């Protein structure tokens, strides 16, 4: 478990708020992945989760609507506590709303995270280090 964190994500968020929230932890002095934990449809995010914590102490799965675009009704109770039922998962809403998150996932909607409204790249950068 070299670095401290490893960022999953959509495609579409990479450059956007991935790459400042990578800027912003390693600027604190913290190592972070990225390069190999972008999600593409058909992807595991079992798989992909179980590689990124081999390697990391914590792991980040950001919420946005091109994750949930991305990823069934029959299985939301499974996949979502992939993602929120995980000690050392931390979800990060971006972009997103309260009936969004509801819509695609009931189960995740009222689970414990952080999000990109309430605070800047900079101060989720400081919360998140402070746990490490």
């Known amino acids: 478990s070299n670095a401290d964190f490893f960022i999953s994500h ?3 968020d990479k450059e956007a708020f991935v790459q ?6 390693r600027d604190l ?3 972070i992945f990225y390069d190999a934990y972008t999600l593409k449809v058909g992807d595991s995010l079992r798989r992909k989760i179980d590689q990124g914590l081999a390697n990391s102490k914590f792991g980040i799965v950001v919420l ?3 994750f949930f675009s991305k990823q069934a009704r029959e299985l939301d109770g499974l996949t979502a506590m992939e993602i929120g039922g995980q000690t050392r998962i931390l979800p990060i809403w971006h972009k997103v709303s309260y009936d969004e998150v509801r819509r695609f996932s009931p189960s995740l909607a009222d689970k414990v995270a952080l ?5 800047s790249v900079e101060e989720i950068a400081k919360e998140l280090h402070s746990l490490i």
């Not at 400042?20 to 932890?25: G, P």
């Open 29 to 31: 002095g913290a190592k």
């Open 115 to 119: 999000n990109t409204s309430l605070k």
């Open 10 to 12: 959509a495609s579409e």
């Open 20 to 25: 400042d929230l990578v800027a912003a932890l």
């Open 64 to 66: 946005s609507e091109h």
